[PDB]
């Protein structure tokens, strides 16, 4: 059996495609074989995304793996919702219960609000980026209004790379009006390093302040530069490097060739790459469950036009989403178990605090506790 799937990747995702290659080589099976058709197109421009979707649908795929921007989520929830094609993603969780949307990143708002209620704050700043939606901003504003807090919430995403030195200077000059001490940084893996570098340039990392790196990749950024400053700075981690399987994957990861696999000659790994490596295992386990349930869904590359009027679905894909909700495995993000919608249940997020010798885990968080 040959199962043809589609895979979309943005221009610039080199480490995630390398982790996809490692997951495809490592999780090969005996009963069947996957065939990913890879499209390296832009993720923000929805026209190229729709072209890549219809080009993968013209090939007649059974599943589509790939990323999506916050600017084009309502496209992906539409075309995968009507045509009944499962879409597996390591990107941010959507706002709602969309069918055929299987997602790898757990909720960050609950752990972040739990960390604030553990630290017992009342007046803090919130520097957010406008590229992964505004769900976390609405969550912290709702819980701030419900818990009587004072949030100085500032967008930072509209600042260009040409003059990002005087804007940050005026930003942290305006943050000294009310004598703000505690700042939550909700940015991606690229903006956090620039903000930390400009804080270090203006000198606001001494003992007396606080920072929270609001993502799953707390060890992804360069933390050798605010380690000896040592205010408190904390964050969230999804990849526990002290496990056996994670340490084995790191020991098999750092030995790889940089020219053969770009972005693999690091001691650590980005969280999206780990979610991709887990999603390959999820798709392999679901296809193995269909190979073991004696269900023949084999066809050819004649799925038709994506803009068919009316585009009639094929019902055997409806079980395939019911395949993906029936997967409970163990990967780099710990336990992987899904709900009826497509979100993640029974997960674990470690709360890291950066000490002098390095980051040290102080506890874990789940949704049932």
């Amino acid at each position: 059996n040959s199962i043809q799937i589609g895979g979309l990747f943005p221009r610039g995702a080199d480490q995630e495609y390398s982790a996809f290659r490692v997951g495809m080589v490592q999780f090969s099976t005996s009963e069947f074989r996957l065939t990913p058709h890879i499209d390296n197109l832009e993720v923000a421009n929805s026209f190229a995304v729709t072209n890549a979707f219809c080009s993968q649908f013209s090939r007649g795929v059974y599943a589509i793996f790939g990323f999506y921007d916050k600017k084009s989520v309502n496209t992906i929830t539409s075309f995968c919702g009507t045509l009944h094609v499962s879409f597996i993603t390591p990107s941010f969780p959507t706002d709602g219960t969309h069918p055929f949307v299987i997602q790898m990143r757990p909720d960050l708002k609950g752990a972040l609000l739990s960390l604030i209620e553990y630290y017992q704050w009342d007046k803090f700043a919130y520097l957010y980026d406008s590229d992964r939606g505004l769900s976390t901003l609405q969550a912290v504003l709702d819980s701030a209004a419900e818990k009587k807090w004072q949030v100085t919430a500032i967008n930072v995403g509209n600042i260009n790379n040409d003059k990002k030195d005087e804007t940050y200077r005026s930003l942290f000059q305006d943050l000294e009006l009310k004598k703000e001490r505690r700042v939550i940084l909700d940015c991606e893996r690229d903006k956090v390093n620039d903000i930390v570098d400009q804080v270090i340039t203006i000198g606001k990392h001494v003992k007396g302040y606080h920072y929270i790196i609001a993502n799953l990749g707390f060890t992804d950024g360069d933390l050798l530069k605010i380690q000896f400053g040592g205010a408190n700075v904390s964050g969230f981690q999804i990849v526990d490097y002290d496990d056996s399987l994670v340490s084995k994957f790191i020991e098999r990861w750092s030995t790889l060739e940089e020219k053969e696999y770009p972005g693999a000659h690091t001691a650590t790994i980005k969280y999206t790459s780990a979610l991709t490596y887990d999603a390959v295992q999820v798709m392999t386990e679901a296809f193995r469950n269909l190979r073991k349930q004696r269900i023949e869904i084999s066809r050819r590359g004649n799925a038709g036009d994506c803009l068919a009027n009316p585009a009639v679905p094929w019902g055997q894909g409806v079980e395939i989403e019911r395949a993906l909700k029936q997967v409970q495995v163990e990967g780099l993000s710990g336990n992987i178990k899904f709900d009826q919608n497509g979100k993640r249940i029974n997960y674990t997020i470690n709360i890291m605090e950066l000490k002098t010798n390095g980051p040290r885990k102080i506890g874990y968080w789940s949704e049932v506790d």
Partner: antibody
Amino acid sequence: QAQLKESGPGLVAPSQSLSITCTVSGFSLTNYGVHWVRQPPGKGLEWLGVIWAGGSTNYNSALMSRVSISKDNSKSQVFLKMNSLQTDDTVMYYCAREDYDYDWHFDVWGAGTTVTVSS
Amino acid sequence: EIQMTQTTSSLSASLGDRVTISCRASQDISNYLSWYQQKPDGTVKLLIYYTSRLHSGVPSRFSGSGSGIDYSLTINNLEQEDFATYFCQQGNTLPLTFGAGTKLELKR
């Protein structure tokens, strides 16, 4: 660079065993797959089988009860056993490595050996 | 299963010619085919991956194209080391049936 060298007995009697040893270098055998393929002289090449890094092994549909593959990661060696050989087993054997570059492809192959099954 | 075939068994060319080698399949392979080279001593190397891309370590003189069931490899200029056996390998459905394999020859 990665290299592969196959070795065997060369001459064996009919309906007997045949052990081929493939040694790989320049890489590791704990994270890649090794595919063994036969080649008849003057005919088309046939895929004998393949073994994965996760202990998975697949064989051909017509001779599934005739070939076996094992590996030793300490010496980076692959041992291929073939029993119930016939007179048409005077062929060549090759071992190669598998990879994923948007398709399941063969990246680094070997020199291959010649096996002549005759009594 | 899917049977691959190549009608051209031997091609003759001189130094500096653009030689083409075609390959057909029994069904649509969705361009999931590779083109490999094999010297007469037994050494086998890879030349073109996924029917359009060039592998790291191969020169820029060779190229590949095609669609559907018809794939093709092209050499811009034949060299002395280019005299080998070019073979096509499909990788869509198990078992991975390879091509027939053509052998380049020097024209004199």
